Design a protein around this motif. Structure first.
Motif, short mmCIF file in Angstrom:
data_model
loop_
_atom_site.label_atom_id
_atom_site.label_comp_id
_atom_site.label_asym_id
_atom_site.label_seq_id
_atom_site.Cartn_x
_atom_site.Cartn_y
_atom_site.Cartn_z
N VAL A 152 31.30 51.05 40.27
CA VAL A 152 32.34 51.77 41.00
C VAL A 152 32.56 53.19 40.49
N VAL A 198 38.09 38.66 43.32
CA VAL A 198 38.94 39.82 43.05
C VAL A 198 39.66 40.30 44.30
N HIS A 211 28.15 45.26 37.07
CA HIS A 211 28.54 44.06 36.36
C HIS A 211 29.05 43.01 37.33
N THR A 221 32.38 53.29 36.42
CA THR A 221 32.19 52.01 35.75
C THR A 221 30.88 51.40 36.23
N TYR A 249 41.82 43.87 45.35
CA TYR A 249 41.74 45.23 44.85
C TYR A 249 42.39 46.18 45.86
N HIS A 259 28.55 44.67 40.98
CA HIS A 259 29.11 45.91 41.50
C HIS A 259 29.34 46.98 40.44
N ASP A 307 32.30 40.32 37.57
CA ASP A 307 33.58 39.98 36.97
C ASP A 307 33.52 38.63 36.24
N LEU A 316 40.99 49.92 32.97
CA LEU A 316 40.86 48.85 33.96
C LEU A 316 41.68 47.64 33.54
N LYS A 374 38.07 54.92 45.85
CA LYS A 374 37.05 54.23 45.05
C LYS A 374 35.79 54.00 45.88
N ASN A 387 39.85 56.19 31.95
CA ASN A 387 40.04 55.29 33.08
C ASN A 387 40.25 53.89 32.53
N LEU A 392 45.12 49.52 37.48
CA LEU A 392 44.04 50.41 37.08
C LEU A 392 44.31 51.85 37.48
O1 LIG Z 1 37.82 50.48 39.26
C1 LIG Z 1 37.03 50.24 38.14
O2 LIG Z 1 36.22 51.35 37.79
C2 LIG Z 1 36.29 48.90 38.17
N1 LIG Z 1 36.96 47.75 38.74
C3 LIG Z 1 36.24 46.52 39.09
O3 LIG Z 1 35.06 46.49 38.95
C4 LIG Z 1 37.03 45.29 39.65
O4 LIG Z 1 38.07 44.84 38.79
O5 LIG Z 1 36.20 44.27 40.17
#
Ligand SMILES: O=C(O)CNC(=O)C(=O)O
Ligand SMILES: [Fe+2]
Ligand SMILES: [Zn+2]
Ligand SMILES: [Zn+2]
Lengths: 486, 6
Positions: free
Chosen positions: A351, A285, A277, A274, A287, A349, A279, A205, A294, A203, A266
């Motif tokens: 994910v 962000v 954390h 993931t 997304y 967050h 960013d 990112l 997700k 995966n 991504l």
């Molecule tokens: O999709 C991924 O596993 C993680 N992406 C993020 O945490 C995002 O860029 O804020």
């Protein structure tokens, strides 16, 4: 020297040099190869118990990979870790996690706001004070209204590799090892196509395509994001007279200095995870899920949650999921094909990728979240004091960006303001307060720099900075004298 | 795998 110790090759004793300075031995012919000449990509460096060089494969068979001995460990191959605990998020951990995954609470209306389309988003975003007061996360079901340029559905990984190149190297996460390695886009595709056989999950990112002439036009940030983006403000994509006037003033900035983080692509396999954390740079962000799905696990940027997160990150522990020790702070929010998630500064967050997915998103900084950004910066520095990390995981030229913004943008405006009337609170209250906030943080940077010299490399001489700070203080104090008058 | 660095 000695022939045996000669790749490979490459047929040389020393590589032109990232190879680093590393070789690998062939468990058949016994000849050494520089890693960059073994035929392996970075992601394979730890997979094989017995490596068979290309010269030997058709008559020795493929390379034999370690038996999966501890699927609940990052070192799933090391028999020594069999008895050790379950690590987030090893194969064992993720599997289990999925089964109870949906027991985690949904958000309060104060936390995330769900809107049907961009038109409704705009109205709700404005009700809350806009970007300058942006504090809650938004989920938009339908992009119509967002002015976000995106590929038409049916577009997928196949189109990505064609546009980017099969040899293009992207940094990829080895989910089960919870580490990142390089992989040819082509190599990722092959593994991604093989849906039925996936010893390891991958995966990526980190696929920034703002430098690809074709890609950078297929997937852009929402208009509102472009408008408040600080990076965009400093490295405008203008032309002709504009770019010329941009040059006449020393407002020009090298492309190799620009932080390239606003246009990511991504792609991830089902079962990807993931971990928690924030960013880098406390960036916000956007997304957008083009395909797949997700699940984000989020916690508000409060002091209590930062204290918990900071401990979590500096703690050597590896078996404890952040959610379990966050006191019900972590909430569950699902995003499906076509939907878009908008996260402001600070949000912690994790994910989960329940299904093969292709996403376009991007990170940006903006004045509206200046405090929170700096708070997060402090958070990163605090953590760094303990653990040792790489720099490519933090906001590129974070400090430089602010020096440039202050000089090229904020400073010029306070000056022009000062030259007339002119109370900034009247039509620029937001600019003024951001200036004081950015200045405060910069003062500390300066002081720190004088208490132990600059850093290593480049870029802005201590002399130049000091000159800039002298200028800012002057104009700021002038403005405050104007305000005190009124 | 048997590796090395110089
Ligand atoms: O999709 C991924 O596993 C993680 N992406 C993020 O945490 C995002 O860029 O804020
Ligand atoms: Fe993230
Ligand atoms: Zn061989
Ligand atoms: Zn070599």
């Amino acid at each position: 020297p000695k022939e045996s110790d000669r790749c490979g090759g490459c047929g040389k004793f020393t590589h032109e040099d990232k190879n680093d300075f590393q070789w690998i031995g062939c468990d058949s012919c016994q000849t050494w190869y520089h890693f960059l000449c073994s035929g392996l990509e970075q992601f394979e460096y730890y997979l094989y118990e017995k490596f068979f060089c290309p010269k030997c494969v058709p008559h020795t068979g493929h390379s034999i990979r370690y038996k999966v001995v501890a699927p609940h460990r990052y070192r799933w191959y090391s028999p020594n870790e069999k008895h050790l605990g379950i690590e987030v998020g090893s194969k064992t951990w993720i599997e289990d996690f999925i089964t109870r995954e949906n027991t985690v609470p949904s958000p309060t209306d104060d936390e995330v706001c769900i809107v049907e389309d961009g038109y409704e988003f705009r109205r709700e975003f404005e009700k809350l004070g806009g970007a300058d007061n942006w504090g809650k996360v938004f989920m938009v079901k339908d992009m119509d209204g967002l002015n976000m340029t995106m590929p038409k559905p049916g577009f997928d990984l196949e189109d990505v590799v064609k546009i980017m190149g099969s040899d293009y190297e992207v940094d990829t996460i080895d989910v089960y090892n919870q580490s990142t390695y390089s992989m040819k886009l082509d190599t990722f595709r092959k593994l991604f196509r093989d849906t039925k056989n996936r010893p390891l999950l991958y995966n990526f990112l980190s696929l920034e395509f703002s430098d690809n002439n074709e890609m950078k036009e297929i997937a852009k940030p929402p208009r509102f994001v472009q408008e408040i983006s600080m990076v965009n403000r400093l490295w405008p994509d203008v032309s002709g007279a504009e770019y010329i006037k941009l040059l006449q003033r020393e407002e020009y900035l090298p492309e190799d200095q620009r932080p390239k983080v606003e246009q990511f692509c991504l792609a991830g396999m089902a079962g990807s995870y993931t971990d928690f954390h924030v960013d880098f740079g406390g960036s916000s962000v956007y997304y957008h899920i083009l395909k797949g799905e997700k699940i984000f696990y989020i916690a508000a940027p409060t002091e209590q949650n930062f204290a918990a997160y900071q401990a979590h990150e500096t703690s050597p522990d590896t078996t404890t999921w952040f959610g379990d020790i966050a006191n019900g702070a972590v909430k569950r929010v699902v995003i499906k094909e076509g939907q878009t998630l908008l996260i402001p500064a600070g949000w912690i967050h994790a994910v989960l990728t329940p299904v093969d997915s292709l996403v376009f998103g991007g990170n940006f900084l903006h004045l509206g979240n200046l405090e929170m950004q700096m708070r997060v910066y402090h958070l990163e520095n605090a953590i760094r004091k303990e653990i040792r990390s790489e720099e490519k995981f933090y906001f590129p030229n974070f400090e430089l960006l602010h020096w440039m913004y202050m000089r090229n943008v904020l400073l010029e405006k306070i000056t022009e303001a000062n030259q007339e009337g002119s109370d900034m609170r009247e039509q620029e209250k937001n600019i003024w307060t951001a200036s004081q906030i950015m200045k405060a943080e910069m003062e500390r940077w300066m002081d720190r720099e004088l208490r132990l010299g600059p850093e290593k490399n480049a870029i802005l001489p201590t002399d130049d900075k000091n000159k800039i700070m002298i200028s800012v203080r002057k104009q700021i104090e002038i403005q405050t004298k104007i305000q005190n008058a009124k | 795998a048997r590796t090395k660095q110089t």
